[PDB]
Design a protein around this ligand. Structure first.
Ligand SMILES: [Zn+2]
Ligand SMILES: [Zn+2]
Lengths: 7, 63
């Protein structure tokens, strides 16, 4: 799946 | 529907249709049908799916 994340 | 906002800096902000709150850097997942982006908890995603798995949002899954 297409996922995203930013700390 | 429309869940993208063009902000005063010229950037795009994505809103999660589940909670109507923006992307805040926490994990999101994109619908492979309609291309909306949801926070993981808002759609019950609790661990990263396999990379090869397509994901469909609640609206699209029933279409
Ligand atoms: Zn949400
Ligand atoms: Zn969808």
């Amino acid at each position: 799946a297409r996922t995203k994340q930013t700390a | 529907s429309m869940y993208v906002i063009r902000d005063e800096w010229g950037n795009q902000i994505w809103i999660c249709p589940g909670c109507n709150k923006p992307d805040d850097g926490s994990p999101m997942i994109g619908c492979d049908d309609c291309d909306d982006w949801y926070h993981w908890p808002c759609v019950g995603i609790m661990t990263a799916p396999p990379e090869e798995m397509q994901w469909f949002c609640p609206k699209c899954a029933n279409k």
